[PDB]
């Protein structure tokens, strides 16, 4: 019965990746946030325990973090 809880963090765009990771992982204890640079690619599968945090070259969140 996975994927419950908060599952998207639209207000974290524009935040730093580190700030975002901590907010995500505090608000939903069933996920781990993964910082990844925009354009670098990540597996195209679906996981309820993962939140990709897509960041610019300066480490700013550039897409709304969502479970998947």
Which residues contact Na ion (rule: CB under 5 A)? 9, 11, 51-52, 68
Distance, in Å, from the CA atom of 34 to the CA atom of 41, rounded to the nearest integer, reads 12
Stretch that binds K ion, among 7-15, 17-25, 31-39, 42-50 (CB under 5 A): 7-15
SS3 content of the chain, % helix, strand, coil (to 5): 20, 25, 55
Binding K ion (rule: CB under 5 A), the pick from 2, 5, 6, 14 is 14
9, interface contact from Na ion, K ion, none, CB < 5-8 Å by kind: Na ion
Residue 66 in contact with residue 9, Cβ under 8 Å? yes
| Nearer residue to Na ion within complex by CB, 59 or 68 | 68
């Amino acid at each position: 019965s996975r994927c419950q809880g908060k599952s998207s963090w639209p207000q974290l765009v524009g935040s730093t990746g580190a700030a975002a990771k901590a907010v995500i992982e505090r608000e939903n204890p069933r996920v781990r946030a993964v910082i990844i640079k925009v354009g670098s690619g990540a597996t195209k599968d679906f996981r309820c325990d993962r939140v990709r945090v897509w960041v610019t070259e300066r480490g700013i969140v550039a897409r709304p973090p969502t479970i998947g």
